[PDB]
């Protein structure tokens, strides 16, 4: 769903008005939860979060 | 005296700011019950 969603979506040339900007997006990686503690990284769960 | 989570570890801290258990990272903690004396009627 993602892929396509990012896909589809064309990003055309940006003028202010040579200089021009053009970006794009390549392949979309999505990574499991962890919880950024301030000592290291740790397992997220769901009733971790239920309870913070 | 309080419990940690999946850590088995006495936190006992009374500070506003320390929420979090010593020698872990998780900061859920778990009140432990004294020994009183309570009356139920049966
Ligand atoms: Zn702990």
Same mark, same amino acid.
């Given at each position: 769903?993602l =892929?396509?969603?990012? =896909?589809?979506?064309? /990003?055309?040339?940006? /003028?202010?008005?040579?200089? *021009?900007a053009?970006?794009?997006?390549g392949?979309?990686?999505?990574?499991?939860?962890?919880?950024?503690?301030?000592?290291?990284?740790? /397992?997220?769960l769901?009733?971790?979060?239920?309870? =913070? | 005296?309080?419990?940690?989570?999946?850590?088995?570890?006495?936190?006992?801290?009374?500070?506003?700011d320390?929420? =979090?258990?010593?020698?872990?990272? *998780?900061?859920?903690? *778990?009140?432990?019950?004294?020994?009183?004396v309570?009356? *139920?009627?049966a």
């Amino acid at each position: 769903g993602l =892929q396509n969603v990012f =896909q589809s979506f064309g /990003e055309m040339l940006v /003028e202010p008005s040579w200089r *021009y900007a053009t970006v794009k997006f390549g392949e979309v990686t999505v990574e499991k939860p962890t919880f950024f503690s301030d000592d290291k990284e740790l /397992e997220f769960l769901p009733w971790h979060a239920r309870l =913070q | 005296t309080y419990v940690c989570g999946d850590c088995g570890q006495e936190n006992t801290l009374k500070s506003g700011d320390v929420i =979090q258990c010593r020698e872990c990272g *998780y900061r859920i903690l *778990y009140k432990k019950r004294t020994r009183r004396v309570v009356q *139920y009627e049966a």
